[PDB]
Design an enzyme around this catalytic site. Sequence first.
Site, PDB file in Angstrom:
ATOM      1  CG  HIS A  66      -5.368  22.094  19.522  1.00  0.00           C
ATOM      2  ND1 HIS A  66      -6.579  22.392  20.106  1.00  0.00           N
ATOM      3  CD2 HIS A  66      -4.499  21.896  20.539  1.00  0.00           C
ATOM      4  CE1 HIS A  66      -6.445  22.373  21.419  1.00  0.00           C
ATOM      5  NE2 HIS A  66      -5.194  22.074  21.706  1.00  0.00           N
TER       6      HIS A  66
ATOM      7  CE  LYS B  54       3.004  13.343  33.471  1.00  0.00           C
ATOM      8  NZ  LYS B  54       3.682  12.893  32.233  1.00  0.00           N
ATOM      9  CG  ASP B  55      -2.151  19.169  32.270  1.00  0.00           C
ATOM     10  OD1 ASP B  55      -1.050  18.583  32.153  1.00  0.00           O
ATOM     11  OD2 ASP B  55      -2.732  19.726  31.310  1.00  0.00           O
TER      12      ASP B  55
ATOM     13  CD  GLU C 100      12.362  43.950  36.923  1.00  0.00           C
ATOM     14  OE1 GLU C 100      13.457  44.548  36.883  1.00  0.00           O
ATOM     15  OE2 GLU C 100      11.430  44.203  36.137  1.00  0.00           O
TER      16      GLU C 100
ATOM     17  CB  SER D  19       1.943  17.245  21.999  1.00  0.00           C
ATOM     18  OG  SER D  19       0.986  18.086  22.605  1.00  0.00           O
TER      19      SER D  19
END
Lengths: 42, 73, 85, 89, 99, 365
Positions: free
Chosen positions: F187, F213-214, F257, F191
């Site tokens: 923050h 959108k998220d 895994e 971004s």
Amino acid sequence: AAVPATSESPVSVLCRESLRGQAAGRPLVASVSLNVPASVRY
Amino acid sequence: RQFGHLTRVRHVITYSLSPFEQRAFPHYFSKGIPNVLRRTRACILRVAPPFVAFYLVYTWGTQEFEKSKRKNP
Amino acid sequence: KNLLRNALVSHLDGTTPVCEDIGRSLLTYGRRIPLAEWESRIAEVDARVVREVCSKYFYDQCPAVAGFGPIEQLPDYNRIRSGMF
Amino acid sequence: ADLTEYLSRHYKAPRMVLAAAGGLEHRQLLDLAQKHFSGLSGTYDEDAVPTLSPCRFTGSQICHREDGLPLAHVAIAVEGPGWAHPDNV
Amino acid sequence: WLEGIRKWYYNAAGFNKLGLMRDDTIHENDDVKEAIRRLPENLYDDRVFRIKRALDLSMRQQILPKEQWTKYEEDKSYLEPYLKEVIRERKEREEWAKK
Amino acid sequence: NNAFIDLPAPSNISSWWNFGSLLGICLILQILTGLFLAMHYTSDTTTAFSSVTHICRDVNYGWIIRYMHANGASMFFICLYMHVGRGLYYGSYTFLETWNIGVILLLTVMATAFMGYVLPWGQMSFWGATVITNLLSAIPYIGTNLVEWIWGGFSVDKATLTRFFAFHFILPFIIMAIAMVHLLFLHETGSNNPTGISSDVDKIPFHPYYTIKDILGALLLILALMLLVLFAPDLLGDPDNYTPANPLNTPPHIKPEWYFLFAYAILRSIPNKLGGVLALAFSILILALIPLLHTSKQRSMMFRPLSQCLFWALVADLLTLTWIGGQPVEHPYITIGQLASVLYFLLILVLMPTAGTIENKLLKW
Ligand code: HEM
Ligand code: HEM
Ligand SMILES: C/C=C(C)/C=C/C=C/[C@H](OC)[C@@H](C)[C@@H](OC)[C@@H](C)CCc1oc2c(O)c(OC)cc(OC)c2c(=O)c1C
Ligand SMILES: CCCCCCO[C@@H]1O[C@H](CO)[C@@H](O)[C@H](O)[C@H]1O
Ligand SMILES: CCCCCCO[C@@H]1O[C@H](CO)[C@@H](O)[C@H](O)[C@H]1O
Ligand SMILES: CCCCCCO[C@@H]1O[C@H](CO)[C@@H](O)[C@H](O)[C@H]1O
């Protein structure tokens, strides 16, 4: 009052037409209001 | 970082329409497909080769492995 | 209502404002609406009428927005549109 | 020519109002009207009669960013009813 | 010719397709930020609009019509004289700090 | 507010930027299904495996919560790898604090998933606990002591299972606190975006644009998760963990895994104990070096053809190492894995920094 002033204050001329009337011609008067923008004439 | 203090911008005009006045899917297929095709083509030479290499190494190694486990490779 | 009454009568003060009200009114309403009529129209407005008329024109309606100057902080249209409800 | 065409189509007697307010009598005003505006055209014809179509309102936004100016001006509005609507009161 | 692969590279890099000039794409570090701050009004405003136009095209995952692509032969370094001096100034200070 | 609602965001971030929120959702999902499983799980070696079958057979909807947790861990890694890949490709690593915290987050999630896999005490649980804790034995002079101390004994046993339940229980909450710090540093800068160019001239509010959108992204994550849970819950798992732990026998085709296969391939390629452990550690820790290896004058790879080609070669190479990790230590896999392991470090330490310099030259700066 109910009527808003001709010009609301806060804190352009490029032609001879828009300049006519700008010269002062009488003594100054200052107004203050409760409900209306202040003004200063002349 | 807050709107009002990001950076300095002068002389830029932006025109917009309300989402209620416009379509959400304008020319979805008519223009979308061409754009997808364009984007796909523009990157393919950069994305695909390494994976083709993987494929070749993958098939070659797997075959080589099997062949090595029998009497007459 | 009281503010409106005062604005109406104080505006029609002097020959020029009255002359203009005559000329423009005939063009817009087709007649001069007298002060007594404006009074009747004003008197009938109450809280219910204000809620209903405001709801009719403002409530969940798309606005038109104009901005000029250092407006990086002017809200995004969607945000402005959601503020209408 | 543009100006005369415009004035020709728009300055017609039925679209004008001679108004007066003050120390005068309507009878004198009217007599002066008859005297001076009688020859005012009351007919462009029927091919001209300029008539206004309604104007569509669009929910939209126009932003002219200019960080060089000291204060921001913002105007926002919804579509109003039009002159003659009672709702205006 | 190196120069041959250069024009090829320029087009492959593709920032020209978004209407950007090479200097619009530099990574901004403190030297660069100081250089941008020193730009005259017109160069600064032009940079801002080209970047804004590019960000808009990127959001729509679009590019400009080919005729509007920045042309290799016409791309010039408007930032260089400013950045070079900013770096020179910092180097001078760094030398002095060691004495 | 201002940490969400009016948070300024670039107008152009793509779907590659959806993985951060998806990681947050994977974390919440793991915590929620995890707590509910912990309400029925018992960590004693005599009853661990049994309690898990009890969850799947008799606890109402126990089976769906369990398979959602197991497959959720897989989704977590898919998202983590996509998230890191986005960062490398777009130069997001220049946000140093955010990036390095991210590296810590990757290691903590790896450690967390490792310990959870040990909980059902099946065969893979037991040998994974054995092998991975033994990585510490490579530490000179005190390595063996550290391992026995972690185990609570001379071999993996009860003491181990019980403390692992405790560690696995608390670590995800620590991860959550570390992730909040991850976001706080982010923050400070806001971004990065696909162009690698500052987006301050075109920021849009996070809400409603990225909130919706998220949500769309979250729906797609849930679809992928539920396709696995409802149609192929064992696809990404290992059949050997349906066999209770047997300290006397290591399954002949034991394998890690899937999300650990690339690292396992790298370690297996070196016929030396300390060397293999160092390569393993370095295959992850090298992420901390990426910022220092950045030579390009440009932040993102969007405008860098040569860098892009090497980036996809790295992804293809990790795919190769993943495949090799699933194959026996036999010819020609031994050699393919050694080449792939060498190629991995070579691309990151030498080829990419070099492509960066060449690209600079070609642009004349
Ligand atoms: C529990 C794990 C993690 C969570 C919950 C998480 C979450 C987030 C969130 C919410 C964002 C913002 C959205 C986005 O851009 O994706 C973000 C950005 C970012 N993260 Fe992570 N992260 C995690 C792990 C990591 C890892 C492992 C790395 C890399 C080693 C990392 C590096 C970054 C960087 C550099 C950014 C800035 C991205 C940009 O602006 O381009 N993150 N993270
Ligand atoms: C970063 C988050 C987490 C990850 C990545 C994770 C991962 C795992 C993995 C891989 C397993 C093995 C699943 C199997 O095959 O059975 C497991 C088991 C388990 N986990 Fe987690 N877990 C997380 C958080 C939690 C939390 C918060 C709890 C509990 C408070 C929890 C409780 C359990 C329990 C009790 C089991 C044993 C039952 C089972 O195997 O399903 N987990 N976890
Ligand atoms: C008390 C807490 C402790 C001791 C935590 C330790 C955490 C260590 C690391 O996480 C940070 C570690 C999980 C991570 O290394 C970076 C992995 C990529 C290592 C992957 C890994 O997995 C295997 C595995 O899963 C198996 O399963 C049945 C079997 C295995 O060989 C037989 C392996 C194996 O040979 C390796 C290298
Ligand atoms: C719904 C509208 C309310 C009715 C208001 C009418 O009001 C009336 O209008 C007449 C015409 O000018 C006036 O002469 C009269 O004095 C006035 O009270
Ligand atoms: C990854 C491949 C890089 C090779 C250098 C590119 O070289 C360029 O290729 C163009 C198209 O083939 C030619 O038209 C051009 O004359 C040539 O210089
Ligand atoms: C999402 C697509 C995954 C590809 C399907 C194959 O998946 C693989 O199957 C093997 C046995 O069949 C398993 O041992 C292995 O762990 C699993 O990853």
